[PDB]
Design goal:
The structure is cut from a larger assembly and holds 14 copies of chain A, one copy of chain O, one copy of chain P, one copy of chain Q and one copy of chain R. Chain A is mainly α. Chain A has one domain (about 1-75): F1F0 ATP synthase subunit C (F1FO ATP Synthase). Chain A has three helices and no strands. The longest helix of chain A has about 40 residues, at about 1-40. Chain A is elongated and about 60 Å long. By secondary structure, chain Q is mainly alpha-helical. By secondary structure, chain R is α+β, with helices and mostly antiparallel strands. The two termini of chain R are about 25 Å apart. The chains are: A mainly alpha, O mainly alpha, P mainly alpha, Q mainly alpha, R alpha+beta. The interface between K and L is large, with 59 and 56 residues. It is classed as membrane protein.
Chain lengths: ~80, ~80, ~80, ~80, ~80, ~80, ~80, ~80, ~80, ~80, ~80, ~80, ~80, ~80, ~220, ~40, ~35, ~130
Amino acid sequence: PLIAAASVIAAGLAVGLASIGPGVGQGTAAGQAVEGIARQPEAEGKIRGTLLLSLAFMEALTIYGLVVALALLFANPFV
Amino acid sequence: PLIAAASVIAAGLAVGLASIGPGVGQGTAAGQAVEGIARQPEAEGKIRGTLLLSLAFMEALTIYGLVVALALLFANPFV
Amino acid sequence: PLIAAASVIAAGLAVGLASIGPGVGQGTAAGQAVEGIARQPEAEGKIRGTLLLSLAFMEALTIYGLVVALALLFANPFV
Amino acid sequence: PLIAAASVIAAGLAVGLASIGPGVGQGTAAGQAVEGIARQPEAEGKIRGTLLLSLAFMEALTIYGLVVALALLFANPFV
Amino acid sequence: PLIAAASVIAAGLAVGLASIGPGVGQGTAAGQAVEGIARQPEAEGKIRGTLLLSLAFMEALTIYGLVVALALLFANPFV
Amino acid sequence: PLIAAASVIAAGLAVGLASIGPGVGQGTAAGQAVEGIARQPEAEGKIRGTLLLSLAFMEALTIYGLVVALALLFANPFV
Amino acid sequence: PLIAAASVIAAGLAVGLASIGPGVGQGTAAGQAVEGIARQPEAEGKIRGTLLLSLAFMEALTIYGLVVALALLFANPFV
Amino acid sequence: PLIAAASVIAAGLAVGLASIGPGVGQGTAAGQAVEGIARQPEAEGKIRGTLLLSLAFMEALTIYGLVVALALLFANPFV
Amino acid sequence: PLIAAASVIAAGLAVGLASIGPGVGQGTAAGQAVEGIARQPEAEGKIRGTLLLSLAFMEALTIYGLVVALALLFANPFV
Amino acid sequence: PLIAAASVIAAGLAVGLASIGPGVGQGTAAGQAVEGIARQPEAEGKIRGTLLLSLAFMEALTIYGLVVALALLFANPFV
Amino acid sequence: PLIAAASVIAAGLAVGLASIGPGVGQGTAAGQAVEGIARQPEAEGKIRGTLLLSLAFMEALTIYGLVVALALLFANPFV
Amino acid sequence: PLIAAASVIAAGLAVGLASIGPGVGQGTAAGQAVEGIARQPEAEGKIRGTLLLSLAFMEALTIYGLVVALALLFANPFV
Amino acid sequence: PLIAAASVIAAGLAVGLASIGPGVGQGTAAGQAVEGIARQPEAEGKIRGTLLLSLAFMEALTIYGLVVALALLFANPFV
Amino acid sequence: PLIAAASVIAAGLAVGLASIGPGVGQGTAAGQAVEGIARQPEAEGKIRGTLLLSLAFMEALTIYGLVVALALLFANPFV
Amino acid sequence: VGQHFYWQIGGFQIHGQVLITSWVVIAILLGSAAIAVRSPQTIPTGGQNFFEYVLEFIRDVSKTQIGEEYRPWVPFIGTMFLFIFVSNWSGALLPWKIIQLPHGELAAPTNDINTTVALALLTSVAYFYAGLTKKGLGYFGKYIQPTPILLPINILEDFTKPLSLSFRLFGNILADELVVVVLVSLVPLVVPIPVMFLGLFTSGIQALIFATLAAAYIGESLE
Amino acid sequence: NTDILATNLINLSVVLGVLIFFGKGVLSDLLDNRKQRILN
Amino acid sequence: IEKASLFDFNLTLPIIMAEFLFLMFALDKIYYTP
Amino acid sequence: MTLNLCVLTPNRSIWNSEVKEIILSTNSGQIGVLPNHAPTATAVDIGILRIRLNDQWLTLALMGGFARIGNNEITILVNDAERGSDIDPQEAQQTLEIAEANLRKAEGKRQKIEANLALRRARTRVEASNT
């Protein structure tokens, strides 16, 4: 009825909105991480160690928007 | 009824909106933490100590939005 | 009825909206805290004492929006 | 009826909107407070006295929105 | 009826919208007020006399949204 | 009826919106004022004599939003 | 009727948005003015003759919004 | 009827919207005119004759929004 | 009826919306015109010969919205 | 009927939207064109021959909205 | 009926929306092109050959919006 | 009916919206390309071979939206 | 019926929206690439190998919104 | 019915909305990655090894929106 | 208040106000200029300085925009400045709300499209006259020189050069006079006079930006 | 017929006056300076 | 009397093209050449 | 009464008389100066320096360096500088031709560094001989 139709719009708003914050975040992180290799390539493992760890924090923001968005579709307690 | 449909839309807006503030925040903090490594690689242990601690605060701004959005679905007092 | 449906929408807007400012704010405070460590690593104890004391304020701006977001669901005087 | 439902959405807006203005403000205030310490660390007590005083003004901007938002739920003269 | 429900939503926007103009303003004014102390620590007492008055003009912009929104709730001449 | 209900909403939008321009405006005027005291502390009285007049013009832009928002509620001709 | 309800909403939007353009404008025009006095303080009277003359043009942009917003309330030809 | 209610809302949108372009415009123009005076005072009269030259164009943009807002209220052909 | 009510709203938006580009543009073009006079004040007639030629192209953009906004009210082919 | 009411709203949108992109563009394009004159005044005619040729492209973007907004009114095939 | 009323609003949007993109783009592209002439006027034949070609790509973006917008009015297959 | 009215509004958003993203992008790409010719005119054919290939990718983003908008009108499978 | 009318609007919002993120993103990438060639032209085989590879990824973000938008129209399972 | 109509809209917001953050992100990531090659071309394999691993993260943000948008079309459980 | 007109019939309908308003500009242009060319002097006397400094100004905006061959096009650009400069300064300064025609207003010759689209075509013929005289009759500046696929961009540029140059001049004079028309209905004349001085400022400038840009299309056609 | 009313021409008065006076000023300043240049 | 109805392409365009070319030739003979 | 200005080479100070108007080229390209100019430190290009004092105005070519300005004082540090009149007019354009062929025979980096640096030294030497 209305419940399955309103759950399915928020499954698109959860993911659509969640993706936006991190996309700018993972871009300015990887943007200055590769500028940093150009100033000193001897710190590549120091940069790729911190970048791949901090990009995992921004992966965790939009994966929470997909935990909700799959819960609205699949494990939906309302329908 | 309407209450199940109104709760389920706000489950997507709570999570979706929450992801946006932090993504732009975990990107400017991470990008200037990796740029700070390339300026002086001796202080990686001080940079990773300040970055991962401050990324946990910005992670806490999103897990607030996941506590509410799952409480609208799972422990929903109104349905 | 309508009151339980209007209260459960604003719990997703109270929290979602609240997290946007701090996520953006705690990024630029932490990013110029770690850029400051690379400028002078000897002052980490003056920086972590200043960052975490000032990240505690921007953490409190979202917990104010979480107090209302939990008051609409759990300690709701209207329903 | 409709009055309690309109009061309970606005409680959410007052707190949610209030978080946004200060969140970005306390970021740039604390962000240049920590970068100032890395410029001259012997001026710390002049900085923490000026940071924590000025963060108290930006904490007042959100607590004005919270006093209204609690008064919509608890001390509501219209319901 | 409709008079009270419209008076209670506007009590949220007025307090809520007001925080945004000042929140960014009390940040970038006080943010360079702390960086200015790090450049010239001899001029602290000149800065705090200029800052605390200029923040009070920005505290007065938010207090106008409070006096209106408290007049929409408490001293409401329409109901 | 509708006349007092539409009047009371725009008493919240007149005042709330008014704060936004000045809140951001009085910040960057005070920000480059206090930064300027750090560069030349000997020119303080020329700065406060300019800032207290510059903040007075931007205080006037928001007090226009209060003159209407007091007129919509108290000296309301339509009700 | 509906005319008096639509004339009073636009009385808020007339000055609701009037403040927004100029406030932001009177900030950066007064912001670089006080930086100008702090740079060469012998040119103060060449600045206050230009600042007060250019803040008058932006105060005129908002007094246009106040004239309309007071025309909708008092000298309203439709009611 | 509907015509006098629709003409009166666009009287607020014409004026409010028109003011926004100029405030931003007369901030960057008049801001870099007073900074220019500080840099080269000898050129005050060459700046004021180019500033009030160009502030008259941006005052002319808002005066289009004023008179159309006066044409909807007073010289209205439709009612 | 609806034709005269729709024609009278869009005459407020055409004028208001069009004005935003010129206000924003006629300040950045007038901003770096006076900043150029401060550099080399000999080239003022070389700058005013281009500045007046530049601000009238942006006066042409607002005026196309005002050719329409007077054609919607006065030379209205539909009513 | 509705078609004359729908077409007259879009003529306020076509012109209004079109005016915005160019107003912002012709300020930044001519603003750096005047700054280029003040750097090398010996190349003024080299700049104006490139400026006015490129301002005619941004003027062409706005005028495509004036072609539509007059075709919605005068050469309207639907009414 | 509603088919021609929807097609006549959308034509307005397509021409209107397209201008915002290339309007800002042709101002930054022609803006740094003319600032590039003041660095080295010897390559003005190299600048104008690349500028006028690159503006034709941005001119093609809006004219793609006008091929659709004329096909909603003139060659409209639904009416 | 409703199918033809909804398929024609989306043709305005398909290309109206598509023009916005690329247009801003092709301004920064062409703007620093023509500045790059000013930096080193000896690599003009190295710049134009990269620019005209990279402008072809951004032009292909709007041509994707032009395919959809010319699919909703002419080769529309729903009518 | 209502299914095909709602599906066809999302066919315009998918690629309409998809064009916006990538176009802006692509422009900066090519913008600092070509100005990077003007710094060191012998690195062009390294630059074009990195630009044309990364322009394929931002192209791949748009083709995700195009595969959906063609699937809403052509291979639509609901109609 | 309403369920298949509300599901098919949100597949346009999911994939369409999702692309916006990453598109801006991959542009500023690969933007400074290529400018990094123009400073030190000997670190190309350090730059391409870091960029392409981080472009896969921003690929993973947008591919999350595709997974939900394909789950609304193909593996849609509500219909 | 009033955006209408009365028409005069000579087989077709033509505007009475436009012809009449324009005639005064013609009589004030020839009537004041030809009083100083009656007996010239070597050293310019009082009154001849202003008509010489105008003529030295027209040579500035012709030579800078056209080039070495500005000197045949001086009387054209000298008309397109002065017929548009004096037409706008007649609207603000000459008191014509005292005279009452029984059907319409009298402010300016350029308040209708019929003047402004004619002046946009008289400057459109001029760069097709200069474009087809100096260069070849077979192929001229519209020929697709940098790329062959620039054809619809350059065909449509032919239409936008008289059209955007017309509605620039048409609108800002119609706007300026209407602000005078509207604000008089609200308030006596002591309030709108700073707004009229903002209007009389741009009233002469839109004439100057006409003749500057009109010469700027001449030099484009000659290349 | 002539329409006599003191709500138009009065304003025209003030600004025409101002304009005239200052125009006189500037023309003296800019035409006499050109005359001294040609006499120079 | 009638309403506004501007955007009139009546014969005032050839009238004002004629009177403008008359002004350009007469003003030529009095001002520009002399 | 104005700004004073000194132009000093690594062995010899050229100008030390008060002037009202200079317009120096720079790495940006052109900067005009009037007195009461805010203190600014720029780098100067290898090009001409046009100076306008009371009646007569003249150009002194300078071969690039550093120009900072203060409280009505412009010191210009330039590693070689010649007055635009004291270069004989045609004779620089002979030496420009000695450079213009020498870049046509330039090969390798160091001959494309040395010719193009000395060409711009020579090409902005002739432009003072005519100014």
